[PDB]
Amino acid sequence: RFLKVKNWETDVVLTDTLHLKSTLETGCTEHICMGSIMLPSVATKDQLFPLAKEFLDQYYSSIKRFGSKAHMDRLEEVNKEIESTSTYQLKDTELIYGAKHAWRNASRCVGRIQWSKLQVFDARDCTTAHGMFNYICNHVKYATNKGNLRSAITIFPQRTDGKHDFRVWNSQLIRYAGYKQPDGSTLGDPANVQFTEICIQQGWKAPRGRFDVLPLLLQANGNDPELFQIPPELVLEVPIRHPKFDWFKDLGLKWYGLPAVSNMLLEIGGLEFSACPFSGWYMGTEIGVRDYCDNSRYNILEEVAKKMDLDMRKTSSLWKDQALVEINIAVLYSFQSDKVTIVDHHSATESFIKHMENEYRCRGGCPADWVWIVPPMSGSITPVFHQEMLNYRLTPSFEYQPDPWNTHVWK
Amino acid sequence: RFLKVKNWETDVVLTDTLHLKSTLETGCTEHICMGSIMLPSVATKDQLFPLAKEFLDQYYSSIKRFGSKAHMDRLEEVNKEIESTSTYQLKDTELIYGAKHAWRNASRCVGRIQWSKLQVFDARDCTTAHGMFNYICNHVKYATNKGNLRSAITIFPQRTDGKHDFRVWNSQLIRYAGYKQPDGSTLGDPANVQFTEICIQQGWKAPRGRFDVLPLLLQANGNDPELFQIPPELVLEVPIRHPKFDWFKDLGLKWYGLPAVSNMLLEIGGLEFSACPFSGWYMGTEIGVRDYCDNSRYNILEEVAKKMDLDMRKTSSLWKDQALVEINIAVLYSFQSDKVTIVDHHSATESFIKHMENEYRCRGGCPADWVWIVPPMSGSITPVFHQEMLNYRLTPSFEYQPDPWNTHVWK
Numbered sequence: 001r002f003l004k005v006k007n008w009e010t011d012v013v014l015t016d017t018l019h020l021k022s023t024l025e026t027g028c029t030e031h032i033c034m035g036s037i038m039l040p041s042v043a044t045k046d047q048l049f050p051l052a053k054e055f056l057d058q059y060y061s062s063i064k065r066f067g068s069k070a071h072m073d074r075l076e077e078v079n080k081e082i083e084s085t086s087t088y089q090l091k092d093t094e095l096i097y098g099a100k101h102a103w104r105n106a107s108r109c110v111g112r113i114q115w116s117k118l119q120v121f122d123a124r125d126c127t128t129a130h131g132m133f134n135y136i137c138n139h140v141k142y143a144t145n146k147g148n149l150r151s152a153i154t155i156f157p158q159r160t161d162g163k164h165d166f167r168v169w170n171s172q173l174i175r176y177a178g179y180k181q182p183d184g185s186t187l188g189d190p191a192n193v194q195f196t197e198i199c200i201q202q203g204w205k206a207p208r209g210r211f212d213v214l215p216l217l218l219q220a221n222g223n224d225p226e227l228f229q230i231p232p233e234l235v236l237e238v239p240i241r242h243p244k245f246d247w248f249k250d251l252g253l254k255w256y257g258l259p260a261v262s263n264m265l266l267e268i269g270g271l272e273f274s275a276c277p278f279s280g281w282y283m284g285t286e287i288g289v290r291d292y293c294d295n296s297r298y299n300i301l302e303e304v305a306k307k308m309d310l311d312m313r314k315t316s317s318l319w320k321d322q323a324l325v326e327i328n329i330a331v332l333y334s335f336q337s338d339k340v341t342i343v344d345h346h347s348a349t350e351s352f353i354k355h356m357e358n359e360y361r362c363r364g365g366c367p368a369d370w371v372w373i374v375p376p377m378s379g380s381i382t383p384v385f386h387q388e389m390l391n392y393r394l395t396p397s398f399e400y401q402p403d404p405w406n407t408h409v410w411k
Numbered sequence: 412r413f414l415k416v417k418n419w420e421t422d423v424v425l426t427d428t429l430h431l432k433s434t435l436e437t438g439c440t441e442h443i444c445m446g447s448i449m450l451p452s453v454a455t456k457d458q459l460f461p462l463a464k465e466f467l468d469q470y471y472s473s474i475k476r477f478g479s480k481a482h483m484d485r486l487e488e489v490n491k492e493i494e495s496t497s498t499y500q501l502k503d504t505e506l507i508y509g510a511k512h513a514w515r516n517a518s519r520c521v522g523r524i525q526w527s528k529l530q531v532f533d534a535r536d537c538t539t540a541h542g543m544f545n546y547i548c549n550h551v552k553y554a555t556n557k558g559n560l561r562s563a564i565t566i567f568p569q570r571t572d573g574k575h576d577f578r579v580w581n582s583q584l585i586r587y588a589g590y591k592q593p594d595g596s597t598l599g600d601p602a603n604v605q606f607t608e609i610c611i612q613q614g615w616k617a618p619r620g621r622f623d624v625l626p627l628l629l630q631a632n633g634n635d636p637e638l639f640q641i642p643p644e645l646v647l648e649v650p651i652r653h654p655k656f657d658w659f660k661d662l663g664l665k666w667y668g669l670p671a672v673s674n675m676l677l678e679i680g681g682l683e684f685s686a687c688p689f690s691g692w693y694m695g696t697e698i699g700v701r702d703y704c705d706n707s708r709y710n711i712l713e714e715v716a717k718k719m720d721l722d723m724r725k726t727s728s729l730w731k732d733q734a735l736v737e738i739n740i741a742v743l744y745s746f747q748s749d750k751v752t753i754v755d756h757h758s759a760t761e762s763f764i765k766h767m768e769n770e771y772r773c774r775g776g777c778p779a780d781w782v783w784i785v786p787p788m789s790g791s792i793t794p795v796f797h798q799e800m801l802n803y804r805l806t807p808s809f810e811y812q813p814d815p816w817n818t819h820v821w822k
């Protein structure tokens with residue numbers, strides 16, 4: 001009931017009581033552990049007040065006014081509005097708290113040392129897909145900041161009935177397009193080949209190349225979604241070169257500065273924000289390892305090993321490992337030479353251990369998903385490999401949600 | 412009740428019913444997942460017959476004589492001997508089945524495609540620490556096989572009362588010594604600094620260098636353990652050189668061929684074999700990444716990066732990643748040039764996916780611990796990163812047990 005986690009590199013031991021405040025379930029039982037399953041899985045008015053009271057009780061327990069008059073009146077005020085409308089509305093202050101703590105509680109996020117430096121843009125007055133486009137452009141501009149990236153989230157009107165949801169249909173606001181070929185192979189990004197076809201099915205004229213920024217598909221208050229093209233001056237991009245290999249320029253790769261994830265669901269005191277694009281910056285390995293070297297992604301280990309002139313006959317020459325290190329040296333180098341914010345897996349994983357120490361001390365714990373925290377290269381030479389982590393679900397939280405082209409009633 | 416696991420690189424989906432036959436617990440609950448905790452945690456006669464019947468029922472269900480006359484007589488025969496002695500004895504055939512399936516069920520082992528090619532040495536007639544030494548030498552010789560390594564296990568008398576346990580006190584039969592210095596730093600292997608002091612406390616004269624093979628500490632039928640030195644001709648060793656960097660010889664590193672783990676507990680039909688050293692061969696990363704580059708181990712990223720002439724000022728130059736790839740190219744290269752069996756993390760992790768497919772088909776599943784299956788470098792460029800794995804505990808099994816110098820009543 002007061003579990004211990006250990007670091008098997010420093011022998012540092014931390015004690016977790018926060019997990020007791022945990023609410024939702026994990027997927028594991030006493031007889032099976034599902035910690036490596038990828039995907040871990042209308043709200044009546046009855047259910048809504050406990051969640052509202054729970055959230056409000058921790059919000060006032062955080063500004064050091066827990067149970068005071070201002071708390072009990074806001075507790076009754078929300079009670080009365082849930083009676084009235086069977087739902088309710090968050091103060092601007094409650095929206096910033098919730099949003100910031102959804103991130104704080106994201107157990108798969110290695111960058112949470114930043115969780116309280118987050119810029120919350122309230123788009124709950126938005127009503128049209130054009131207004132969404134506007135808010136999203138102002139998000140991209142603000143968060144990019146000439147390469148000095150700043151974390152931000154734009155929060156669109158909460159779900160109400162279920163048939164009038166605001167959704168961004170892009171998985172990320174900025175994403176490269178994918179096109180299959182006559183021979184079957186894939187130009188651009190193979191991850192987005194279906195979404196790219198949806199945008200074309202809706203009128204996008206594709207500039208069928210590799211690094212084509214996709215248009216925004218925006219669904220407002222349940223209406224069929226509409227295409228908008230981000231002004232290209234707002235899409236900052238980093239051409240990838242190596243500090244040694246001048247043919248690495250000839251490789252002709254480039255990535256975008258701003259990772260801005262738009263397909264998730266933000267849960268605050270029982271309320272559901274189905275459109276809530278959030279952005280920070282990249283850990284280097286997301287691009288260098290996964291985007292560039294996942295077999296089903298850009299898959300450049302073949303080509304980089306060729307230009308490096310490597311023993312590509314034997315699996316056991318570690319030519320794959322060799323070309324992967326250089327690819328991530330280049331991504332880091334390129335981003336830093338252009339003054340565009342990026343973080344390497346060593347700096348990022350060190351900061352998380354330091355972040356973990358702060359959470360166990362001033363909060364009683366820190367939910368963490370080892371399968372996701374440990375970087376996808378060089379696992380054990382980073383300090384998170386050697387750190388035991390307790391995973392549990394706290395709220396406010398970010399959740400997965402189905403893609404809207406399977407849910408939506410079309411016209 | 413019939414769960415699905417997916418590979419997010421091939422979209423291959425396998426269905427697991429084996430987990431229903433699971434017995435022991437995992438440490439996870441519906442509200443916390445402990446899949447990254449390192450350590451996952453006398454037997455009365457009442458408890459012993461269910462475990463005996465369970466094991467025997469699956470042993471006869473495996474030779475296609477489930478419930479026949481030979482089964483029911485052996486079921487009654489063991490029933491009667493557990494009445495008699497409150498314990499019982501395994502046939503030689505039952506010992507090989509159990510031992511082989513303990514390995515088959517080891518969810519953290521990536522090499523289990525070999526589980527049925529295992530040589531079982533029955534040392535249940537052993538009575539003295541000298542006889543243990545003898546059996547263990549014959550194990551090392553047989554399993555080494557002039558570098559053409561062969562998997563084997565030597566099984567010493569089962570626990571009975573608890574105060575008369577057979578134990579090997581070495582963590583592995585072959586291990587390098589560790590000595591701390593006046594200034595505090597550590598010669599040899601820092602992992603074994605305490606055990607090395609125990610052997611010296613018992614009379615070992617240390618040849619205080621790096622790669623000093625430790626003597627065997629053997630405890631027989633509960634008696635105080637006794638030192639024996641493996642004949643050096645039986646300890647095969649691989650000097651580590653690089654196929655490019657001739658100063659890598661001057662680094663002067665070497666490892667032993669045979670990984671033979673001696674500190675675990677083999678559980679078969681409720682019986683407990685506290686001494687059961689088992690051996691196979693190395694995946695390359697155990698040595699190249701963990702043994703050589705764990706901060707608390709040999710820790711040679713400093714020195715290899717120096718000789719490579721690297722940017723060692725910035726964390727973000729990936730000089731650590733760079734020196735780690737070369738170190739594992741050398742370990743592989745050295746082992747293969749000497750005809751000593753080793754496997755690279757790519758070949759080994761591919762075989763496990765192929766092994767997984769066989770288990771889900773002819774067995775209904777395959778318990779697997781992702782945190783341990785994914786190699787400690789280059790995670791996602793190997794196919795196990797992208798493979799969902801269900802972890803659950805089946806029996807027969809290998810278990811951890813406390814170090815005997817904390818348990819034992821000394822004289």
Ligand code: HEM
Nearest residue numbers: 103106108109110111114151153278279280281282283398
């Ligand atoms: C400050 C810079 C940030 C960095 C360096 C960072 C880094 C990462 C990385 C590498 C992942 C793993 C995801 C993957 O590999 O696909 C992740 C997950 C995640 N992050 Fe952070 N992140 C940052 C900011 C944020 C912000 C601002 C939020 C929310 C407001 C957030 C919420 C999440 C969530 C919800 C997930 C994982 C959910 C999932 O896909 O299961 N992150 N982060």
Ligand code: HEM
Nearest residue numbers: 514517519520521522525562564689690691692693694809
């Ligand atoms: C055939 C060659 C084998 C290879 C290549 C191999 C590979 C591995 C590796 C890399 C690990 C991870 C352990 C670590 O990183 O510390 C492991 C775990 C394990 N293997 Fe295998 N292994 C082999 C044979 C065997 C045999 C013959 C047995 C038993 C008879 C066995 C039982 C286990 C157990 C019990 C564990 C992990 C238990 C733990 O420490 O939690 N293995 N194996």
Ligand SMILES: N=C(Nc1cccc(CCNCc2cccc(NC(=N)c3ccco3)c2)c1)c1ccco1
Nearest residue numbers: 038259260261278279280281282283294296419420
């Ligand atoms: N579909 C596949 N995998 C997959 C499936 C479902 C989900 C996922 C994981 C996709 N989360 C993307 C994501 C979420 C959060 C943060 C970041 N990053 C950041 N820095 C960032 C953005 C904003 C602030 O910070 C990236 C992956 C697949 C097929 C083959 C290989 O993979």
Ligand SMILES: N=C(Nc1cccc(CCNCc2cccc(NC(=N)c3ccco3)c2)c1)c1ccco1
Nearest residue numbers: 008009449670671672689690691692693694705707
């Ligand atoms: N004490 C630490 N970690 C730690 C603690 C407890 C347990 C462990 C894990 C130690 N299993 C060793 C092991 C078990 C089984 C197989 C192999 N290998 C083989 N190929 C092999 C041998 C026979 C057949 O196959 C290696 C590690 C520590 C401190 C700092 C960094 O780590």
Ligand SMILES: C[C@H](O)[C@H](O)[C@H]1CNc2nc(N)[nH]c(=O)c2N1
Nearest residue numbers: 036037038371372796797798799
């Ligand atoms: C099957 C497995 O759960 C899947 O590959 C996970 C593993 N860990 C991950 N970790 C991160 N950060 N991102 C990922 O996409 C994944 N994928």
Ligand SMILES: C[C@H](O)[C@H](O)[C@H]1CNc2nc(N)[nH]c(=O)c2N1
Nearest residue numbers: 385386387388447448449782783
């Ligand atoms: C804290 C964490 O559980 C620990 O580092 C584990 C992670 N996975 C591992 N995987 C293997 N194969 N060997 C290990 O020693 C470990 N250590």
Ligand SMILES: [Zn+2]
Nearest residue numbers: 028033439444
């Ligand atoms: Zn679990």
